[PDB]
């Protein structure tokens, strides 16, 4: 079955720039700006669009060793990005995939709002509980703030 979770968060970075950096250039940025969160990102196959598979490895001591994420859809006009966690980490005999949707919208003050949906597709009769969702939110927030700090400090990056 499916467990649906949603959250929103804010950024001080304008939407288009944040989408170009945080969403479209994570493979480069996350290990650079948040090395204590992400040890590496490997592109396994594909050229960036639907179907691209990346292997995201976590540092030693983290709960999970890695996940593989698959890009589902990329909307450059509306700053929407869909991807799924398809292997590793929590994926296995209790959990088939986690499908995610991110949308970034501009705010009049020159920042943005990120709207995030996470849909857990379980196998069998298993509950997706609060702690698991909190950890994913914490990871996302950490990555966002690290990219935000980098973009504030490197004004010529991603214009
Ligand atoms: Na704002």
Author numbering: 1 to 159
Article excerpt on this structure:
The conservative residue exchange Y5F led to a slight, insignificant decrease of IgE binding (1.46-fold). However, Y5C exchange had a stronger effect (9.03-fold). This can be explained by a more pronounced change in the protein structure, affecting the mutation site itself and the changes in side chain conformations of the flanking residues Phe3 and Thr7. Because the variations in these protein structures are strictly localized to the immediate environment of residue 5, we concluded that Tyr5 is part of a newly identified IgE epitope and involved in antibody binding, which might be due to IgE sera from different patient pools in this and earlier studies.
Partly conflicting data on the allergenic significance of dimerization were reported for the birch pollen allergen Bet v 1, an outstandingly well characterized model system in immunology. It is the archetypical representative of the pathogenesis related protein family 10. Here, we report crystal structures of dimeric Bet v 1, revealing a noncanonical incorporation of cysteine at position 5 instead of genetically encoded tyrosine. Cysteine polysulfide bridging stabilized different dimeric assemblies, depending on the polysulfide linker length.
